[PDB]
Amino acid sequence: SGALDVLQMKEEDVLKFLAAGTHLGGTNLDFQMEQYIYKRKSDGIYIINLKRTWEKLLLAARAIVAIENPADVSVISSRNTGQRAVLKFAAATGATPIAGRFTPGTFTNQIQAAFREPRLLVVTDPRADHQPLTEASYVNLPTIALCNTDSPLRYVDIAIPCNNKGAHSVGLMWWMLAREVLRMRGTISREHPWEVMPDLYFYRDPEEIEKEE
Amino acid sequence: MQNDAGEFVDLYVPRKCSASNRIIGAKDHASIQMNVAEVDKVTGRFNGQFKTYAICGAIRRMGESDDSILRLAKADGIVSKN
Amino acid sequence: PLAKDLLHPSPEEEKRKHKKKRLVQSPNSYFMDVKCPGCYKITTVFSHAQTVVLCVGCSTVLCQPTGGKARLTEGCSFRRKQ
Amino acid sequence: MRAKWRKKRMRRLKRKRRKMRQ
Amino acid sequence: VRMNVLADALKSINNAEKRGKRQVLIRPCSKVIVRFLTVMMKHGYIGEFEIIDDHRAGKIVVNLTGRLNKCGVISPRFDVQLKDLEKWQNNLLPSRQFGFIVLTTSAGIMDHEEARRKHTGGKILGFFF
Amino acid sequence: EWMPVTKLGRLVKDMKIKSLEEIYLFSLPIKESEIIDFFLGASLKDEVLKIMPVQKQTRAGQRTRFKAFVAIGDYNGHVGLGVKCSKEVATAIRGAIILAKLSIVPVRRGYWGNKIGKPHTVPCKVTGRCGSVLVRLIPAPRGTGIVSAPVPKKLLMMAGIDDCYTSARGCTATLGNFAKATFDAISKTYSYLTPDLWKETVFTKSPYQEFTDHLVKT
Amino acid sequence: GRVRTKTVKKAARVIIEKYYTRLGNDFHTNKRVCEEIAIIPSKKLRNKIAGYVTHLMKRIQRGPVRGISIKLQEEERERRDNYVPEVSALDQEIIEVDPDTKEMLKLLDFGSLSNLQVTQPTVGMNFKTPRG
Amino acid sequence: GKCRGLRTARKLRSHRRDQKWHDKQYKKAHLGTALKANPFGGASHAKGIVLEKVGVEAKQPNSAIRKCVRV
Amino acid sequence: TKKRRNNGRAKKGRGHVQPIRCTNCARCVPKDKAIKKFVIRNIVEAAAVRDISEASVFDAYVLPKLYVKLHYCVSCVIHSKVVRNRSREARKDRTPPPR
RNA sequence: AGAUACCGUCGUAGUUCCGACCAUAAACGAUGCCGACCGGCGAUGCGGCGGCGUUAUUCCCAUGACCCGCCGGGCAGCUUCCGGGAAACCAAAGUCUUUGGGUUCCGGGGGGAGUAUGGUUGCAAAGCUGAAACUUAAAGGAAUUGACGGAAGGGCACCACC
RNA sequence: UAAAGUUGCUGCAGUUAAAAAGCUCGUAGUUGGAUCU
What we know:
Chain I: Component of the small ribosomal subunit. The ribosome is a large ribonucleoprotein complex responsible for the synthesis of proteins in the cell. Chain I: InterPro entries: Ribosomal_eS26, Ribosomal_eS26_CS, Ribosomal_eS26_sf. Chain I: Component of the 40S small ribosomal subunit. Chain A: One of its GO terms (molecular function) is laminin receptor activity. The structure is cut from a larger assembly and holds nine protein chains of nine kinds. Chain C is mainly beta. Chain C has one domain: CATH 2.20.25.100. In chain C, the strands form two sheets. A three-stranded antiparallel beta sheet of chain C has the order 2-1-6, with no helix packed on it. Chain G has a two-stranded parallel sheet with strand order 1-2. In chain G, helix 5 links the parallel strand 1 and strand 2. The longest helix of chain G is centred in the middle third of the chain and has 18 residues. Helices cover 46% and strands 5% of the residues of chain G. By secondary structure, chain I is of the alpha+beta class. In chain I, the strands form two sheets. In chain I, strands 1-2 form a two-stranded antiparallel sheet. Chain I has a two-stranded antiparallel sheet with strand order 3-4. Chains in contact: A-B, A-F, A-G, B-C, B-E, B-F, C-E, E-F, E-H. The interface between A and B is large, with 38 and 37 residues. Chain E binds two RNA strands through helix 1, strand 4 and helix 3.
């Protein structure tokens, strides 16, 4: 942000975070995620300082915007909880998605079919996305990650402190990142709410779609 | 860099980590040079400017790239105080 | 990590430390004015007293030595100084 | 050969030598 | 037990610089440690430092600029004449273009170049580059 | 005809990168030897340091492959080392030449004493390590030449080092470890922070960012 | 003893990945289109390939296949995931918030929100699984 | 570790002097048993009288009769 | 070379551990090195349980169990398949088999 | 086959205690001691400190048993591109050609050989100190691939079986 | 003699390659915290 009141966090954003459980971390804390936690609860749960969450989300959006080829940003999700969110982010923002299993050698093996050379890498969970992250250490790839309290911060350059376990929180974080990136780009304004809503980025269990059909 | 006559005799000047000031090597493939888009103070949009931060692969391996980049952004006015 | 300010530790972190590993060592102990309802004068008791202190105006036990902090008898009002 | 049995042979040799040189 | 507090100080500085830390705590402090650190600072190798006064022996918080490759002590403090200074420079310094051998002479604690300028030998305390 | 496979290869072929030093400045991995042929492929000399027959025991015989250790480099400021193993010696040498091209690093040269002329020696004492083999390069006065074993001498000459003292420790009889240790020592020349490199780095536009439009539109 | 070799499987995958529009669900038509659009040097190989193609068509109708990937499936799935509920599952009238996160919000100057219901914390401190 | 003290010269020199005796070449060249057991007595050559011609069998990997003389 | 960091025993922080006799061969093995099994088995087999329960003068007498402590030496424990060889990586695993 | 062994039945010294000797073990962490610095995590033992809550001393505090943390020493464990190393592996076996914190002991290719000899100690057995002639191109460490195993676990076959 | 950093003060080794005394105590020896313009 930079104390720019146009970039300050809104009441609606705070309510979205509190409803998605974004502020709720885990029972374990990586020593490098200490600076992002407010305080531990009476039941061993760590609360995530959402001011730092917004600060890191804005920093990640700034890093994403400073790539004038949007397809040079790679958005990765191995878990099902963030595959639809990653696809929606790639569609809205113009990035390149990898939803599903990440084939090792994608960044390193020039001969492979899915070989690509992104300029920035964003992942849903450094624990579950450890394979692209490691390959990021081979091709000079900056990395953004949605990190929980116990997330490992190796090869993670911009760590966004948020709950990345629940589907609601993952979808909301990806939606907010897409919204911030678009707002910094110029498309869509900062005045009226975005016409898209977080539930598009969410993940529904197959039983949920069966219930909805 | 300089000889007695004053002309520069180096092949090139390697860049240094913005976090540790140590020289980033020619075959340090885990090092990154990340650009953070600058924003107009009133409109809150990309004005075409950015801040460049180079982090060597050692700091990224230690897991201190996050803290180092956050601190570099804070000192540049990108990140709000506290 | 890698940027900890060792000259200005936060007071909570410095109170968490061992009394000797602090930036400037300070004791965890204290002195208390203790007063008994059956007494007309106060006395000064060390928080970690190793002897059995008796009332200045009576014959009652005031604090019993323990492994660490002494056990002040109930009904006695104790207030820390400084 | 096991080293302890070599040691035992050497000790028996030394005893036989002690009997040699009284 | 602890001997050569300068050795411990320089080891702490070296280990903190290897780790990439911006600051290091040195304890206990001493006049020799402060003079060595000042000689280090005038050449731009460590930058500013602060002496915490506890009422038994000082501590020093040294800000670290990542310009330091190796700071080391030479134990025992061999007495060095001006003739042997070149041999010590060849042994301890990485190059003739940089690196300093610190000596305690009757004129104070100073690098080898200042010792040559003042035309004095002394006892070698250590080196830094 | 070279058809680039990577973004860096496309930028080099399209004359967007003007020297190897812009690639070195950003530590980008070079994965096509045609980039090295483009930038230095008029002064590069190759030299097979060794052909080593290695064997794998099998049920009905020893499978024998040959490992080619090849040093490369124009005798000014650039050197590379490549080790490639194959069932055929010629194929091994070809692969080793390609790998030595892929591993070419910039060599920093300095002055022993006073700084008249061009740099002639290593800027400082550097040490390379490979499997118990320690190779130390020490700056030497002008005109002394390379005071070393033949194996490190070949690499130091191909690196453009005019004169240098050396020390070796360990099992230098293993030519591969000796060569890799002296290559490490040579490559550490530019990674050494000397006081002339204390000036703050002025960051420039990376090749992938400064010609992103060209990559998109080509 | 009716496992399909990787030749048949790979050829069927390529045919399905390139020529989805032409083929159908009846083996006696898949074989004809395959022999039309491919050089299959044996009748038996063509029959095996067409049979696995029919099996793959029976596989795709019930859902996307792991080994099958064409642009048409991608657009159809993005159409399928173009689902947005009437009311957002996120924002509702009352959301529970613990006292500690309430203090965190009051630090952020968002502690005066009325959507927040201050729930009580856990009665005890039993959150570690027994060790052993 | 080794003693590094300004007054350890005697200890260091004594340790070096004792440990030199564990070097086979130094002990050979500084004991006198090797010199007294050397048939040449420390010389490079020696004159002798041939007592007989002998044929010494080569070591196991090779097969030959090396012609030598007892002098 | 060292096969195990603990040397195949649990003698950390002491110098001597009292020995025990192997239940199979009576070999002397340190108590922390021996492989210990605690078998709590029904005193009658699953075959004889039907006849024994049918012939019982009580109703729901519940047969008593048998609590046996076995201390195998390494040779006997390996021969009896109570433990078996493991790969160099899998040797480090210390969770008991699920059973 | 032979068994001067393994297996079995007996069974002396011994195994036990007291006093006097002996001073050796794969006496092992095969890793001297003292000191500083250098990652993380969860446990556990002792002491201390702080705190929701449960339980006992019929009820109040104290104190016990739990629970959640912190601090200090301790036996350890997991993890890590700290760094090291020939590697195995080691948060020490790291802070080592960028080589110096203090100090003791001790090694110098393999055998001959811990032998001969002298000295010393012991009642003895033996302990400590301890060579040389001669001989030899290798012994050896770690790891890899095979082959093999009277090692384990899987799989296959009417030239295997049911 | 150098090579031999295979006698290592510079400058070697001692978990497994040769090697830390079984273990403490202890005199000589070696080494010894801050501080005085």
